[PDB]
Amino acid sequence: VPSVSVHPLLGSHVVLPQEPEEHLWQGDVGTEAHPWLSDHRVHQVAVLPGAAYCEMALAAVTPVLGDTGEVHDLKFHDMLLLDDATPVWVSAAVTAPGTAEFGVETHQSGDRTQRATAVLRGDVDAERPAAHSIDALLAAHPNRVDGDELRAGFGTVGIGHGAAFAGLSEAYVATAAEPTVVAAVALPGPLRSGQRGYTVHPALLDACFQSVIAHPEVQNIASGMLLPLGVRRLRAYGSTRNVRYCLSRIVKADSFGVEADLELLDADGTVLLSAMGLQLGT
Amino acid sequence: PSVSVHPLLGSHVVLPQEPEEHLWQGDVGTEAHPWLSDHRVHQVAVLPGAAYCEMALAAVTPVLGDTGEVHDLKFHDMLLLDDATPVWVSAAVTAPGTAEFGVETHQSGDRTQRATAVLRGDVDAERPAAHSIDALLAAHPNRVDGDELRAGFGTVGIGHGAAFAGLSEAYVATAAEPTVVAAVALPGPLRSGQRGYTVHPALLDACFQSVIAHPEVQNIASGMLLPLGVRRLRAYGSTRNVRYCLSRIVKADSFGVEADLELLDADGTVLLSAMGLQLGTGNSD
Numbered sequence: 161v162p163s164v165s166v167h168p169l170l171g172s173h174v175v176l177p178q179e180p181e182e183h184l185w186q187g188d189v190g191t192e193a194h195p196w197l198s199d200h201r202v203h204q205v206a207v208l209p210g211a212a213y214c215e216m217a218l219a220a221v222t223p224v225l226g227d228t229g230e231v232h233d234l235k236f237h238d239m240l241l242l243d244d245a246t247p248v249w250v251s252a253a254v255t256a257p258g259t260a261e262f263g264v265e266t267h268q269s270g271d272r273t274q275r276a277t278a279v280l281r282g283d284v285d286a287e288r289p290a291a292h293s294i295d296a297l298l299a300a301h302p303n304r305v306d307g308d309e310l311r312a313g314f315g316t317v318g319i320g321h322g323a324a325f326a327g328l329s330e331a332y333v334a335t336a337a338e339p340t341v342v343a344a345v346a347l348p349g350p351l352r353s354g355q356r357g358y359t360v361h362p363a364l365l366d367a368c369f370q371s372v373i374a375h376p377e378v379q380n381i382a383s384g385m386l387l388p389l390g391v392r393r394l395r396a397y398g399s400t401r402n403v404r405y406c407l408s409r410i411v412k413a414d415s416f417g418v419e420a421d422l423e424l425l426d427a428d429g430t431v432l433l434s435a436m437g438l439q440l441g442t
Numbered sequence: 443p444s445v446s447v448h449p450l451l452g453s454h455v456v457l458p459q460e461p462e463e464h465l466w467q468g469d470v471g472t473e474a475h476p477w478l479s480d481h482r483v484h485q486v487a488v489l490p491g492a493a494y495c496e497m498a499l500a501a502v503t504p505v506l507g508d509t510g511e512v513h514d515l516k517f518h519d520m521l522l523l524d525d526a527t528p529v530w531v532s533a534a535v536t537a538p539g540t541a542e543f544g545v546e547t548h549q550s551g552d553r554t555q556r557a558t559a560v561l562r563g564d565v566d567a568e569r570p571a572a573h574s575i576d577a578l579l580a581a582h583p584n585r586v587d588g589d590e591l592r593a594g595f596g597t598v599g600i601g602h603g604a605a606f607a608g609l610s611e612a613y614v615a616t617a618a619e620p621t622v623v624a625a626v627a628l629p630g631p632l633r634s635g636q637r638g639y640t641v642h643p644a645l646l647d648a649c650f651q652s653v654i655a656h657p658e659v660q661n662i663a664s665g666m667l668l669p670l671g672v673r674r675l676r677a678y679g680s681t682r683n684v685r686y687c688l689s690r691i692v693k694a695d696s697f698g699v700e701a702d703l704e705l706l707d708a709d710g711t712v713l714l715s716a717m718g719l720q721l722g723t724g725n726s727d
């Protein structure tokens with residue numbers, strides 16, 4: 161019997177029989193298809209992490225535009241409660257050469273709900289940011305923040321990260337006056353076998369987003385439940401299989417939210433993925 | 443990870459809308475399916491009508507939840523094949539147990555309908571009774587050689603290569619007896635890649651060819667005779683072990699033929715029924 165390789169989240173792919181060019185994927189982000197998604201909970205119910213929409217957008221760039229390219233103005237709309245089966249429909253419509261409108265939608269018996277929107281770009285000639293020295297980053301951020309204690313803090317405001325989402329081992333900071341965080345993050349071992357096919361495993365990317373909350377300025381404003389709301393710019397430069405660190409920079413932190421820029425690094429300090437203008441809020 | 447796909451229907455999705463509608467994007471090109479180079483009209487590869495029959499048969503279970511049957515299949519616009527030939531298949535559920543089926547392609551910026559049918563899931567049809575193969579052969583003593591029949595098709599521009607040469611011989615009585623019995627099997631080399639098919643289109647096409655061996659058809663319908671539609675199609679089980687085809691000429695005139703077919707195993711069990719197969723010139727040009 162023949163078979164077709166599919167993205168683990170996007171699922172079955174087709175190009176609609178019409179002009180202009182429009183792609184459609186039907187996936188399943190339910191907890192039976194993906195048991196690891198039971199490990200990201202809001203008020204003890206499984207909810208799709210914003211990191212999963214990031215991956216869906218990143219994974220859609222090559223089939224739609226012919227290159228890995230990048231994702232612009234990714235926004236997450238109503239929070240998606242997961243069930244054993246949670247069908248999702250991802251769409252990408254080419255509006256002009258090198259650019260496409262991206263969307264993610266679901267159903268609840270009789271109403272279409274938009275879950276995420278973005279713009280896919282395949283003509284931005286981006287230069288990979290320069291590699292960092294992990295040793296030099298760690299020397300400059302001497303104060304350790306334990307991953308278990310950080311996750312315990314998230315639990316106090318109703319965010320529950322189980323084993324699949326426990327990839328942040330520790331975060332390193334200086335003081336609130338230094339805007340950076342250096343975190344040790346890795347995809348947990350049991351998911352490392354199901355990592356091929358992903359541009360970035362959402363469980364790893366979520367662990368990177370979590371590291372932003374370890375920053376002393378973010379801790380000082382004590383805003384409560386901070387969840388990802390969007391990402392201004394996402395770009396993968398290579399495979400994220402060997403990501404071991406995340407360098408984040410706090411761009412703004414106040415009562416309205418937190419904005420940060422993130423770079424996923426391997427053990428040599430090479431930049432494998434950029435997430436600029438991560439927006440966190442209530 | 444991966445998913446199993448039908449070899450012709452390809453990738454499958456349900457549209458995000460109501461009423462329920464299915465869409466597949468497949469490939470019926472000769473690079474994905476080299477055996478399709480062996481069905482030619484005027485020395486170019488053309489998708490056989492039997493392929494649309496299979497696409498509709500294969501769509502019933504995912505759309506309506508049972509193998510069911512296919513009604514009023516029609517395919518009047520010969521599809522010229524390339525290395526890659528994309529097809530889009532649609533099935534819109536109009537009522538419980540019924541769905542509007544369609545097949546379309548692209549060429550430049552224009553969309554062409556290749557086939558239409560109705561998928562049915564609520565027809566409680568019983569398998570027709572089995573036959574004694576010995577009794578069928580005793581009643582049709584006159585042999586029609588497969589190779590000679592295919593050479594006759596070549597005179598009117600239809601070229602059946604090795605993959606489409608599954609008809610070994612047909613047996614007939616006279617033009618006054620409306621039945622043909624044919625010895626027909628999927629060629630040996632295609633038996634490995636027959637998985638996922640309800641009926642292999644190269645086998646079903648060889649059955650359709652056997653209708654033309656009938657002396658009533660030979661005596662009056664002298665032009666190009668290509669399948670144009672099938673009124674009722676139903677598979678009763680696997681067709682992997684089909685060895686014979688029993689056909690009945692319902693109508694035959696200068697312009698075409700209407701026939702009823704039963705694909706049989708070597709014990710005479712009916713594995714698939716095709717009622718109201720329509721043969722005619724169509725649009726050869």
Ligand SMILES: [Cl-]
Nearest residue numbers: 232233279281
């Ligand atoms: Cl943009």
Ligand SMILES: [Cl-]
Nearest residue numbers: 447448451452
């Ligand atoms: Cl399929």
Ligand SMILES: [Mg+2]
Nearest residue numbers: 472473524525
């Ligand atoms: Mg070829």
